[PDB]
Amino acid sequence: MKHSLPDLPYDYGALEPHINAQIMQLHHSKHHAAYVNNLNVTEEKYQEALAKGDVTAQIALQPALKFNGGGHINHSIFWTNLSPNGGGEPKGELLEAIKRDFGSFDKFKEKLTAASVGVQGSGWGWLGFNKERGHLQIAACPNQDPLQGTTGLIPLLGIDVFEHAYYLQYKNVRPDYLKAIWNVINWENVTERYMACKK
Amino acid sequence: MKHSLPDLPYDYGALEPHINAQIMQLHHSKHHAAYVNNLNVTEEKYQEALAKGDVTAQIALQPALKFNGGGHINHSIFWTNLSPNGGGEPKGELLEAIKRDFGSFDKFKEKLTAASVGVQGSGWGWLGFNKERGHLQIAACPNQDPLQGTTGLIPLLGIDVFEHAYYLQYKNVRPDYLKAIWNVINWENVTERYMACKK
Amino acid sequence: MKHSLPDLPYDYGALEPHINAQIMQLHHSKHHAAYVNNLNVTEEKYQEALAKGDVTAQIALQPALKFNGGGHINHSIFWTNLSPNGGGEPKGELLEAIKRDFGSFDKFKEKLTAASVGVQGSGWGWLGFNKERGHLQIAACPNQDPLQGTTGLIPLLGIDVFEHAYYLQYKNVRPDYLKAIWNVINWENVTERYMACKK
Amino acid sequence: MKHSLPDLPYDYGALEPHINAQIMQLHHSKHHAAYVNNLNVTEEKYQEALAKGDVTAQIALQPALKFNGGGHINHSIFWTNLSPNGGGEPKGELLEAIKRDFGSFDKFKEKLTAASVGVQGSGWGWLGFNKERGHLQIAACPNQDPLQGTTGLIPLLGIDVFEHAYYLQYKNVRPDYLKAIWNVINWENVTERYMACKK
Ligand SMILES: [Mn+2]
Ligand SMILES: [Mn+2]
Ligand SMILES: [Mn+2]
Ligand SMILES: [Mn+2]
Numbered sequence: 001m002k003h004s005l006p007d008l009p010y011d012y013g014a015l016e017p018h019i020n021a022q023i024m025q026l027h028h029s030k031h032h033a034a035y036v037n038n039l040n041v042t043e044e045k046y047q048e049a050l051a052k053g054d055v056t057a058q059i060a061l062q063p064a065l066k067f068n069g070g071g072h073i074n075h076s077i078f079w080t081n082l083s084p085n086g087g088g089e090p091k092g093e094l095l096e097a098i099k100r101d102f103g104s105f106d107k108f109k110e111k112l113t114a115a116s117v118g119v120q121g122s123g124w125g126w127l128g129f130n131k132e133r134g135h136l137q138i139a140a141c142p143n144q145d146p147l148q149g150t151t152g153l154i155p156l157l158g159i160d161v162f163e164h165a166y167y168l169q170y171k172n173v174r175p176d177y178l179k180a181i182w183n184v185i186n187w188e189n190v191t192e193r194y195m196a197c198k199k
Numbered sequence: 200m201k202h203s204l205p206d207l208p209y210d211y212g213a214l215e216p217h218i219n220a221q222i223m224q225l226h227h228s229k230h231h232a233a234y235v236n237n238l239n240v241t242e243e244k245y246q247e248a249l250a251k252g253d254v255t256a257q258i259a260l261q262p263a264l265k266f267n268g269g270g271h272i273n274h275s276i277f278w279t280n281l282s283p284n285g286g287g288e289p290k291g292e293l294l295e296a297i298k299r300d301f302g303s304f305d306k307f308k309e310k311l312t313a314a315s316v317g318v319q320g321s322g323w324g325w326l327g328f329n330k331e332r333g334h335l336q337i338a339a340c341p342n343q344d345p346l347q348g349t350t351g352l353i354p355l356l357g358i359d360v361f362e363h364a365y366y367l368q369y370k371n372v373r374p375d376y377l378k379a380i381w382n383v384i385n386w387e388n389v390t391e392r393y394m395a396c397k398k
Numbered sequence: 399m400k401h402s403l404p405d406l407p408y409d410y411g412a413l414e415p416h417i418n419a420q421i422m423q424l425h426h427s428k429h430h431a432a433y434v435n436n437l438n439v440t441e442e443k444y445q446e447a448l449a450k451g452d453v454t455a456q457i458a459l460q461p462a463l464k465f466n467g468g469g470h471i472n473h474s475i476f477w478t479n480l481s482p483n484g485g486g487e488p489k490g491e492l493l494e495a496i497k498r499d500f501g502s503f504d505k506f507k508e509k510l511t512a513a514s515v516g517v518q519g520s521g522w523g524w525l526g527f528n529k530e531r532g533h534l535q536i537a538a539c540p541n542q543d544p545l546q547g548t549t550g551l552i553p554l555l556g557i558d559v560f561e562h563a564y565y566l567q568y569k570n571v572r573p574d575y576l577k578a579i580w581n582v583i584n585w586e587n588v589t590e591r592y593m594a595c596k597k
Numbered sequence: 598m599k600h601s602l603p604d605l606p607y608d609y610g611a612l613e614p615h616i617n618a619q620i621m622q623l624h625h626s627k628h629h630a631a632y633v634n635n636l637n638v639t640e641e642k643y644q645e646a647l648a649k650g651d652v653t654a655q656i657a658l659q660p661a662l663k664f665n666g667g668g669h670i671n672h673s674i675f676w677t678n679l680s681p682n683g684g685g686e687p688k689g690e691l692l693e694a695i696k697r698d699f700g701s702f703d704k705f706k707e708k709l710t711a712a713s714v715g716v717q718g719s720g721w722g723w724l725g726f727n728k729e730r731g732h733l734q735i736a737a738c739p740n741q742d743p744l745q746g747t748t749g750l751i752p753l754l755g756i757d758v759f760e761h762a763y764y765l766q767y768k769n770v771r772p773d774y775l776k777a778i779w780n781v782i783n784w785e786n787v788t789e790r791y792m793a794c795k796k
Contacts, residue, residue: 001650030371039652047647051642053598059746062659067319069652106681120266121321121342122362129336133499143320149656163321163362164371172229181546185739200451238453246448249441252399254467257444258547261460268453300730332698348457443617464715518664519740520718520760542716561719561760562769570761585648 070144083186128153174182234270269343282385327352433469479585526551631668716779725750
């Protein structure tokens with residue numbers, strides 16, 4: 001059982017003019033493809049170390065497993081969080097939960113925008129669901145550290161603030177990239193993930 | 200006494216075709232200018248906290264002080280480490296030290312290249328001088344963490360592997376950026392820093 | 399500003415038999431005294447570095463500032479959170495808040511106990527108040543990293559799980575130390591800190 | 598692979614009066630036993646996660662794997678580095694190497710002592726061999742982070758500065774524990790590890 005690079009659920013230029021085709025093609029066919037391959041390489045090395053009981057090799061492989069493994073997790077969710085049919089505001093119970101936990105939808109965007117723009121270096125901004133507390137929660141993750149594996153929160157919406165995700169189009173003005181991405185957020189997908197957390 | 204953005208010792212397009220003018224202009228006039236301003240803002244906030252004895256505010260300001268403060272340190276050295284008159288190999292005692300500590304100049308480039316390309320996320324690759332041991336030493340730093348402040352090593356040559364330092368020209372192929380930058384390394388400046396470490 | 403070691407609100411043997419007198423004496427007159435002394439020395443160096451604009455020295459002093467500065471913050475709160483007249487359960491809105499956010503007082507004890515016992519190495523277990531969300535929140539901190547300075551949460555009740563806090567009496571059985579400390583929790587002080595969080 | 602708690606090469610009271618019998622008994626039968634048991638449980642979970650491709654579970658298990666896995670590595674080496682027939686100074690090439698890399702045996706003790714006493718919180722002080730550079734090197738590790746797995750250096754002599762390693766006897770005065778441990782250093786074992794580093 002090996003991990004595979006999931007196909008993009010839309011054309012490279014489907015999110016224009018918010019995210020140009022050059023960024024989408026590089027972000028998926030180059031960056032994500034490398035994470036999957038490196039992930040499969042690390043898993044095979046880790047399996048050999050675990051069979052031999054080489055705990056030293058297991059720990060030496062952790063940085064490569066979390067970075068590439070997290071990259072495969074984060075980017076796989078990122079594509080579904082975007083869509084040419086996205087934008088606007090969510091509906092149903094998710095919208096009610098955003099108003100209840102953050103006050104309003106605009107306030108929520110402000111909190112997630114501040115968490116995303118506040119990331120110093122490479123990282124991610126996430127809207128997650130706290131299963132224990134039963135409400136929403138915003139958190140930032142450094143580098144490719146996945147949300148659930150490092151915080152326990154269930155990812156609902158992630159914003160890649162790696163420079164490779166916007167620099168070609170927005171250069172150093174990360175806020176401009178954060179303002180535009182809200183227009184293509186696939187709230188239908190984010191709603192499916194939210195409803196799955198409640199039973 | 201406030202920190203200031205040092206002027207670039209050459210034209211934006213002096214390092215072409217290795218580093219295009221668009222990268223140099225953005226890297227200096229936008230990224231570095233922000234580090235200096237944010238650094239001065241943080242120092243003033245830290246001074247107020249220190250006068251009031253507010254240790255909580257001091258610690259809350261550490262991430263902003265190390266990132267912007269380190270950025271001002273790293274980029275100020277980075278410009279002098281490059282030059283249109285650079286490239287080739289160093290001479291004198293520095294070349295002898297590289298051969299003695301790393302075997303050869305090509306081996307040194309291999310070690311610093313591996314440290315630079317091995318940085319997962321944002322960071323820096325550095326050639327430093329270990330004053331205690333009296334020899335050279337290669338080390339990688341995450342994000343803008345400066346070399347001397349976090350390792351004690353005296354910086355001699357730094358390679359910015361932040362994506363903003365090469366993505367516009369080399370995209371995700373960081374190795375291509377590392378291969379080209381060796382042609383514009385200002386070994387005259389790196390020699391001055393090395394000779395200053397010995398007395 | 400010259401920080402000072404606060405006088406203990408009680409004699410070293412007031413919390414027996416839950417925390418013996420030898421631990422209290424060492425924890426206050428040796429461990430806490432060292433943080434204050436080292437903190438004052440570090441603050442003086444930070445003042446000298448700021449006057450000279452030595453950013454390298456500032457970053458090099460951060461670990462000592464956070465450890466000793468956080469130690470002064472944490473232990474100063476720890477003494478007030480304990481009392482010979484403590485124990486039992488809180489009353490009023492704090493008890494209602496514990497029931498609301500954690501289900502019941504017993505469930506809250508189980509969650510904070512797991513967080514304190516879960517600390518690998520040295521650290522602290524904290525019950526804090528999230529002013530932005532307006533409810534309670536449990537969090538663990540590594541080493542002496544203070545709660546508010548590193549997380550923003552306002553400390554209400556802290557449990558020192560440094561080995562020096564229980565080893566002399568409970569040895570490696572940290573769970574026994576967690577069970578015994580509930581008998582001396584000064585809920586009057588925790589309520590004061592909880593009321594200070596509200597308008 | 599089912600890791601096992603290694604038998605001690607001596608009785609618990611063989612290293613008296615430098616390390617009393619109560620510490621040795623607790624450190625081996627309680628502290629080290631917990632790392633092995635928790636390590637075996639964590640490895641089993643890692644095998645289950647790998648078979649299912651659950652990368653989230655793999656990353657969530659890393660802290661427990663590094664702490665307990667590193668604990669098994671460090672303590673297993675620590676017992677062999679000590680002996681009732683130890684003490685004094687090394688001989689042969691190891692002594693020459695200590696003189697070459699650190700000037701003298703006394704200066705080496707001062708450097709490794711400062712590194713061990715300098716650990717803030719829990720950690721380890723290590724004398725290691727850098728195979729790439731072919732000389733000795735001193736390094737400190739936080740918590741149970743093993744030397745080779747996190748730094749690449751081959752461990753030669755380790756000093757446990759976890760509070761549980763000395764507090765019962767020396768209380769908060771860690772320097773006294775560092776001075777006393779030199780009397781039981783098994784330089785015969787350290788030489789074997791140093792000779793294994795060379796062809
Ligand atoms: Mn990305
Ligand atoms: Mn840069
Ligand atoms: Mn303490
Ligand atoms: Mn130990």
